[PDB]
Amino acid sequence: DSRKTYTLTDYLKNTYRLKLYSLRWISDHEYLYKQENNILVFNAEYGNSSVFLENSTFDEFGHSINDYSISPDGQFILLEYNYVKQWRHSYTASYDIYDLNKRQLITEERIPNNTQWVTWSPVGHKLAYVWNNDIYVKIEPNLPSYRITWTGKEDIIYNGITDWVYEEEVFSAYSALWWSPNGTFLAYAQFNDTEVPLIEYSFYSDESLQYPKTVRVPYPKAGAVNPTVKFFVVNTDSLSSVTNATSIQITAPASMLIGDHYLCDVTWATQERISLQWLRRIQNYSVMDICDYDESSGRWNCLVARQHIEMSTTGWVGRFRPSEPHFTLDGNSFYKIISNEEGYRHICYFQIDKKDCTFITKGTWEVIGIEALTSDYLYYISNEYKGMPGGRNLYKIQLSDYTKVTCLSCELNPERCQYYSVSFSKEAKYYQLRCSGPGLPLYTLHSSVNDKGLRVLEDNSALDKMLQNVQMPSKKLDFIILNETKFWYQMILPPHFDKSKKYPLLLDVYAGPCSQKADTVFRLNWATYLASTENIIVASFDGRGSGYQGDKIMHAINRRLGTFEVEDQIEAARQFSKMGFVDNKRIAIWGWSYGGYVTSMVLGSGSGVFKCGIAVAPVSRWEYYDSVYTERYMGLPTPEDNLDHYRNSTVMSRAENFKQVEYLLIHGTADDNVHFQQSAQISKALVDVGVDFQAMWYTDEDHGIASSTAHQHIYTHMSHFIKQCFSLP
Amino acid sequence: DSRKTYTLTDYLKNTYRLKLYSLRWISDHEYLYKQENNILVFNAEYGNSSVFLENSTFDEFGHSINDYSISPDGQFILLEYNYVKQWRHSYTASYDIYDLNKRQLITEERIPNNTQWVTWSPVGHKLAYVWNNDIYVKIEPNLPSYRITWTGKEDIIYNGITDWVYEEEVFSAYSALWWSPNGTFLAYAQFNDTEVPLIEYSFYSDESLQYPKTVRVPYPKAGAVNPTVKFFVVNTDSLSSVTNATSIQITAPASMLIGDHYLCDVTWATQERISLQWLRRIQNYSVMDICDYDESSGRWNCLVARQHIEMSTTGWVGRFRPSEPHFTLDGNSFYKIISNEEGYRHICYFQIDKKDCTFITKGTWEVIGIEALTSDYLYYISNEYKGMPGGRNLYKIQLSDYTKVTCLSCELNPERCQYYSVSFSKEAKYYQLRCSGPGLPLYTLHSSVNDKGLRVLEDNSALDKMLQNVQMPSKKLDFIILNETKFWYQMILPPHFDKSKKYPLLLDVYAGPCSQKADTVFRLNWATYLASTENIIVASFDGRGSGYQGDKIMHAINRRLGTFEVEDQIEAARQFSKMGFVDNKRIAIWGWSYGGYVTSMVLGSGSGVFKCGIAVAPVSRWEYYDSVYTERYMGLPTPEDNLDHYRNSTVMSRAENFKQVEYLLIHGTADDNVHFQQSAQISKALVDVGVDFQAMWYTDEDHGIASSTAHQHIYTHMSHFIKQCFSLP
Ligand SMILES: O=C([C@@H]1C[C@H](N2CCN(c3cc(C(F)(F)F)nc4ccccc34)CC2)CN1)N1CCSC1
Ligand SMILES: O=C([C@@H]1C[C@H](N2CCN(c3cc(C(F)(F)F)nc4ccccc34)CC2)CN1)N1CCSC1
Ligand SMILES: *[C@@H]1O[C@H](CO)[C@@H](O[C@@H]2O[C@H](CO)[C@@H](O)[C@H](O)[C@H]2NC(C)=O)[C@H](O)[C@H]1NC(C)=O
Ligand SMILES: *[C@@H]1O[C@H](CO)[C@@H](O[C@@H]2O[C@H](CO)[C@@H](O)[C@H](O)[C@H]2NC(C)=O)[C@H](O)[C@H]1NC(C)=O
Ligand SMILES: *[C@@H]1O[C@H](CO)[C@@H](O[C@@H]2O[C@H](CO)[C@@H](O)[C@H](O)[C@H]2NC(C)=O)[C@H](O)[C@H]1NC(C)=O
Ligand SMILES: *[C@@H]1O[C@H](CO)[C@@H](O[C@@H]2O[C@H](CO)[C@@H](O)[C@H](O)[C@H]2NC(C)=O)[C@H](O)[C@H]1NC(C)=O
Ligand SMILES: *[C@@H]1O[C@H](CO)[C@@H](O[C@@H]2O[C@H](CO)[C@@H](O)[C@H](O)[C@H]2NC(C)=O)[C@H](O)[C@H]1NC(C)=O
Ligand SMILES: *[C@@H]1O[C@H](CO)[C@@H](O)[C@H](O)[C@H]1NC(C)=O
Ligand SMILES: *[C@@H]1O[C@H](CO)[C@@H](O)[C@H](O)[C@H]1NC(C)=O
Ligand SMILES: *[C@@H]1O[C@H](CO)[C@@H](O)[C@H](O)[C@H]1NC(C)=O
Ligand SMILES: *[C@@H]1O[C@H](CO)[C@@H](O)[C@H](O)[C@H]1NC(C)=O
Ligand SMILES: *[C@@H]1O[C@H](CO)[C@@H](O)[C@H](O)[C@H]1NC(C)=O
Ligand SMILES: *[C@@H]1O[C@H](CO)[C@@H](O)[C@H](O)[C@H]1NC(C)=O
Ligand SMILES: *[C@@H]1O[C@H](CO)[C@@H](O)[C@H](O)[C@H]1NC(C)=O
């Protein structure tokens, strides 16, 4: 073979680019798609298009447009510019509204600058936005706003938006407002961070900044004071009739009010029925209320006969939180993924006023998500196919006959496609399938009426051609047996892989609770280069604590982070040695985030298995990480709860053992998530026992170390480190 | 040669210690010397001693005693404990006073905890101390203290102590209190930092600290708002229990009050005469006031006819600040080191009420300091001897006949001893000479009347014996000529140095204004180990900007930091690389603090001379460093003054040029002096141009990186880096 390899520069410079097909459904029949900067509208049934918005229309706008969104009625477009990222989901921007009829910009009563969130109503063209921590509503795009809240206060009171921990850990979103289905009501949460302690760290900014700024963020670490929450619903139809429309509070159940709790789900069921899920700070007890608008009293009442309890004896509730309900049209019943009697997550069907649900799926595999629901069918994604927990397929279950389950994606191309997600049109008339591996991504359109393939949207044939002329690595996905249990692993294997030879191995680690690092996804990444160019086998293993394989495995680390998931990585590397193609003198380990923690714990174990390793932005001590995530698995760091294990599971306590390995420690100085503190404490502990190691800080980079320059820099630095570690002198 | 070399562990574990002889003169005849925790009193004439304080007298004290301070009359001893370090000189402590005649601790009216500064009066046993930024006086150690100031406010108003910049850059002391010679009056300064911006940075503390704390220090960077100053004198003999003490203000001269200024010297001339020097923020103009107490008015009057102006056309005033005056017994005249018409610093004799002074010394060499003054002789240290700038000897000049200058140390032992300092007894009847190289330190005692060498106090005989068992490096001190100017260098040369072999060379740099890195001092340091064990030549060079050779050289970098001192290091290395015994493929550079700046500027020069280098806590951009030091050399960073050169002299602008060198960048995260910011901006600039480098932060270490464990870790890591840089294929 004399083809070039996939090199570091190929990775860093995006030589071989995966083609996507990102569409946005605007109705049951049409979607928007961007072609040469034009936004086209496509007819799903026939595949024909027209130009929805010419790439030239905003040449003289005066700013770069970061994103857009069309009002559901297609009458207006929201233009987003001046994008300034905040945390993982949050950002601020400027907004203009463009009238698609008059084909003109709206110049009056503009959405203000530094707006924190904006959303169209689900029908028509009402807008709700949050600015300086208060909610505002515009019935019409050109008319004055109605103020909804007056309590907003920077870093203290948040109306309609989440604080740091709710954004990161509870909602995975910045917005905390929820329009009712036809847009009459606006529901929202209000967060109060008054007594939440602040994390503080320096931000250096451009070199022109003479004094560094101190960034200050309300952030509860494990066992600290949490934000408190309240929930309100306002009738937006009353706004133009009343001076100051009342926000009606819906209070949490008595079973939540006894202690610290969270609001963890808000889902509208009908025009006049809302469901809310609450979670106790000890995250093994959750309560769903189902609340009806009382038209005579103007209030929202939650009948206790409609209250649903969800609890767990072996772990926490949900994968990362209680699952969302999917209501039938009439709002009298719902489906929900919950853990069955054998510990497998399956769809349960509830009547809103009956406490026992009926499971509609079962087996030793799990439902991943419910994707659409029509009067006749529920569509869901699972890992059932071929008993492969790292595969994903779309299924269709007949609501009038649960024995009728059709796999819609399994057989479409079984060699190329074992991992699917899906995007349904507005009332599920059409669906886009996204195949993401093990072959090249493939995007296809389908009609729900007959489940017929309409067309291939994107097959990545250009890329397939380019890759022919490259010595690509291959991927092996398989399992090993420990204590009568299957544990899955993957290997990125060098091209021309020869089982008779001995290769250096890099164990690529995440291993957090419900993680999955062994799967059928096609990836072009650093491991691609390491296998292709450096002849390194890059392996990953899903041990105890990993997800999508039932609660027995997932909850094995309950209250005991930093134990089995760490040991099982070491055991995996031993098993890979036994396999006879691994150079036992050249086994390395690396990971980012939770993976940095595990890497560090492994390097500090004294196992003798690993020559060297790299931790990027690691957790080092559970008391340093946020409350919601940490306590879910660890409970509270108090003498009476779990303090002893909090104190027993730190990186720092294993400092002496790092004498036996080569360690590289890396962290961004402006990481708001895993604070630089965490690595600062590892380095100090290594200094204190006289261990030499390598270190790199990334000025002003956060948890993603994702700026273009820092990304290239970190992977270049890590490559040098691995090459040196593995070099035969 | 089977002798051991001087190893890294030898340096790190202090295997070979220099013996000292630290004495404290208590009168014209006697000194105190700490010996095995016992404090002995010695008679200078005979060399006999008695015990003044047994090592066991405080066996039952309950605390480890940091330090001792015996009152001038020998009646009391101040006991210092609970020492908590603050900045370079500042710290807080607790104090008890032990009555030497009652043989008991004083338990009534104790000095409070967290006392910031304490000092005995110069005669007797009064005390002045600062606590919570206010001054208190105790007339007797068991009596209630009088409160002198009431305006003390943390981080804002400082009475009798310095703020950060005055401590670091003006006074080199935390103390801002000055007793009159017999203790009648107590003069003090008051600093007001109201509008001085704060540097803020994180401190991580022990692992147990859940949230890092933010340190906030009022610290004026270049061009920022400076602290303001006021000066006061209080009569301590007329204090009342009933009414508040009255402090008399002495205001600065009009030529100072017109703009920003500093108080830079306070020196009592007589019991009733005090001199003050003030310096403009533009530090090329200073003025001395000489002020007399008016018994009639109780006021202090500074006659204009007694005002002395000192300015510079080529640079700033004084070496690091205007020099201190040395008054005669009657206070009617004084001697002061000032730059003469050739730019050489010599002793000038002033009459208090005449503008012209008379130079009493002259020549192409410099007086370093005035050490003692009697009616017949002034005693000073200079580098006159053998025309060697890096040598120091003690001289005396006959005040009746300036042609009569006698060297008192030059010929004592010219081979061993070329660098002296001196300590005189109260009326200059005796002196202790401290020889510090080129041979082993030698401490001797002398009587002034006929300059007899009375006795050897400490000759390091023991260490000499040990060192003969070790392959010690030698030192060459010599010069090169640049533009017909002599510039001095030193080389630490490996044992068995062979001029025909080729050695790698490490250039050890400081190169700050008035620095001197080429001298005759004997050192046991990191360089000793590099030469002795690793066979590396360690060179240092004193180029333009360096000290003790006149203003032509010293002021060559005026308004132009990061130019000629940087170029001259490159030029010296260039010249060294053309010597037969130097391997031009293995020349490295390193420096700390100002030396780290210069190392970085050199590595970023694109000279091609250096393979690698290490910068420890470097300055990177002059706008980040403090006002008093920076502006002394650079003026103000405004377009009207010197901003263009502030902007041209940064490390960050040279980032691209690092592509051809190996660089190690190191910095303590709690550096209050050269902020971590400075290195954070270097790393970000290197990342931005895609340059790979090595880095190390030191959690919670300051500018000295001097904790036992951090000191060992840094030197270990640097040694690995150099060894790797110098390893041959
Ligand atoms: O940053 C963090 C944590 C992780 C935590 N993540 C964990 C992964 N997580 C989730 C991942 C995925 C996947 F993958 F299926 F799509 N799906 C989710 C679906 C619903 C909710 C959460 C999901 C989203 C939130 C947020 N902060 N650290 C935790 C310890 S080390 C640093
Ligand atoms: O830390 C600093 C600066 C240096 C500055 N130093 C410079 C050296 N300096 C001085 C050194 C010496 C020597 F030599 F005779 F002993 N003697 C002095 C006699 C009187 C006053 C100052 C002196 C004491 C003050 C304090 N902060 N940086 C400057 C730029 S990089 C970091
Ligand atoms: C809309 O009604 C709210 C609710 O009463 C008003 O907010 C209150 O204002 C008073 C006085 O300023 C405060 O003491 C209360 O604490 C506020 N309550 C809340 C929930 O914010 C608000 O001012 C009204 N807006 C207008 C324009 O009248
Ligand atoms: C959206 O749903 C809301 C809530 O049901 C509707 O508002 C109600 O409309 C009915 C008319 O059939 C009235 O009986 C009630 O007085 C209304 N209730 C409230 C709270 O306003 C609303 O009409 C629906 N909107 C649209 C556009 O269909
Ligand atoms: C320390 O300095 C500040 C000025 O920096 C003084 O505060 C000023 O005092 C004047 C007169 O009383 C006021 O009119 C100003 O408003 C103050 N200025 C600022 C910026 O606050 C303060 O009095 C000084 N303190 C002492 C003890 O001298
Ligand atoms: C220290 O010197 C001061 C200042 O000269 C002395 O105080 C003066 O002493 C004279 C002579 O007795 C008095 O007449 C003056 O009125 C005093 N002046 C002031 C301002 O107090 C003081 O006595 C001396 N102290 C010692 C211990 O010698
Ligand atoms: C102190 O230094 C400043 C700055 O170099 C000198 O001010 C300069 O003086 C002349 C005019 O007399 C011009 O070259 C510049 O316009 C001035 N520069 C600035 C920045 O103002 C000043 O003369 C020096 N003082 C002394 C006594 O030498
Ligand atoms: C697609 O084709 C049909 C004609 O058969 C037409 O009615 C429809 O408007 C077209 N859609 C677009 C988006 O061009
Ligand atoms: C705009 O659209 C046309 C295709 O109709 C294309 O030629 C052009 O590249 C697009 N982008 C521009 C002009 O920036
Ligand atoms: C937020 O909580 C604090 C209690 O710590 C309370 O004083 C304050 O009024 C609350 N503000 C609200 C709910 O707007
Ligand atoms: C929730 O967790 C705590 C700690 O494990 C436990 O004491 C409590 O009983 C748990 N609840 C359930 C339902 O198991
Ligand atoms: C030293 O000896 C003399 C007598 O020769 C005596 O007066 C003096 O006190 C002694 N000094 C000390 C400090 O022991
Ligand atoms: C200093 O602290 C100790 C311990 O708290 C206390 O007992 C003592 O009285 C304090 N000293 C003074 C002078 O206040
Ligand atoms: C002295 O001055 C301070 C404030 O300036 C005052 O509080 C105190 O009472 C005064 N004491 C006397 C005795 O006048």
Side-chain angles (χ1 to χ4, degrees), chain A residues 207 211 214 219 624 691 699, chain B residues 200 207 211 214 219 624 680 713:
Chain A
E207 74 174 86
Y211 288 85
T214 296
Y219 185 115
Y624 302 160
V691 172
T699 297
Chain B
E200 313 183 334
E207 165 171 9
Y211 288 86
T214 295
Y219 182 112
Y624 298 154
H713 201 274

Side-chain angles (χ1 to χ4, degrees), chain A residues 407-524:
Chain A
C407 189
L408 301 182
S409 61
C410 291
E411 301 305 326
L412 291 178
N413 192 333
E415 294 81 22
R416 186 185 173 166
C417 288
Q418 290 155 38
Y419 206 103
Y420 282 93
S421 60
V422 67
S423 175
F424 280 91
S425 68
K426 244 56 184 180
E427 299 162 37
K429 189 166 215 132
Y430 301 94
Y431 54 96
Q432 187 203 33
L433 286 168
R434 308 177 265 253
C435 159
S436 62
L440 297 170
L442 174 64
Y443 301 86
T444 49
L445 201 63
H446 309 265
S447 41
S448 304
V449 72
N450 54 192
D451 293 308
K452 295 342 273 193
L454 292 167
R455 64 201 66 94
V456 173
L457 292 172
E458 171 62 62
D459 64 19
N460 276 294
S461 51
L463 173 65
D464 182 49
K465 187 182 208 321
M466 291 191 84
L467 251 30
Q468 294 279 233
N469 208 206
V470 187
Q471 303 193 49
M472 293 306 289
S474 68
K475 176 171 172 178
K476 154 84 147 165
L477 177 71
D478 211 349
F479 61 85
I480 53 99
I481 290 162
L482 303 166
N483 295 356
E484 334 279 82
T485 298
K486 283 204 268 264
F487 288 107
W488 292 77
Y489 73 90
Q490 60 174 46
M491 292 185 178
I492 312 298
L493 304 163
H496 312 302
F497 170 75
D498 186 334
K499 276 187 182 181
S500 68
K501 293 201 188 62
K502 297 272 170 51
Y503 293 88
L505 191 139
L506 178 56
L507 187 59
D508 178 343
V509 178
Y510 186 79
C514 204
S515 65
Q516 176 170 84
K517 287 277 276 167
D519 65 28
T520 60
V521 175
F522 183 83
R523 278 177 289 250
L524 296 174

Side-chain angles (χ1 to χ4, degrees), chain A residues 41 43 48-50:
Chain A
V41 65
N43 184 283
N48 58 309
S49 67
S50 306

Side-chain angles (χ1 to χ4, degrees), chain B residues 30 41-43 46 48-50:
Chain B
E30 298 190 309
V41 172
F42 284 75
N43 178 284
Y46 312 119
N48 59 313
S49 64
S50 302

Side-chain angles (χ1 to χ4, degrees), chain A residues 106-163:
Chain A
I106 293 170
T107 49
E108 311 158 286
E109 294 296 342
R110 288 204 293 164
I111 291 157
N113 288 321
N114 311 108
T115 288
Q116 295 156 299
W117 184 255
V118 46
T119 175
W120 292 111
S121 49
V123 162
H125 56 251
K126 286 176 189 187
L127 287 155
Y129 65 92
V130 181
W131 173 81
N132 292 166
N133 287 39
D134 284 314
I135 302 167
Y136 296 79
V137 171
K138 296 174 85 69
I139 301 296
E140 305 290 339
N142 62 303
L143 300 185
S145 285
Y146 302 92
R147 188 156 180 180
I148 305 304
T149 61
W150 280 260
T151 52
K153 191 173 175 205
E154 178 179 54
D155 300 331
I156 293 152
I157 314 291
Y158 304 75
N159 298 286
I161 50 172
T162 46
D163 73 343

Side-chain angles (χ1 to χ4, degrees), chain A residues 519-539:
Chain A
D519 65 28
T520 60
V521 175
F522 183 83
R523 278 177 289 250
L524 296 174
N525 59 195
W526 187 49
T528 308
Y529 145 76
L530 296 167
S532 173
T533 301
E534 303 301 342
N535 294 119
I536 295 163
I537 297 170
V538 187

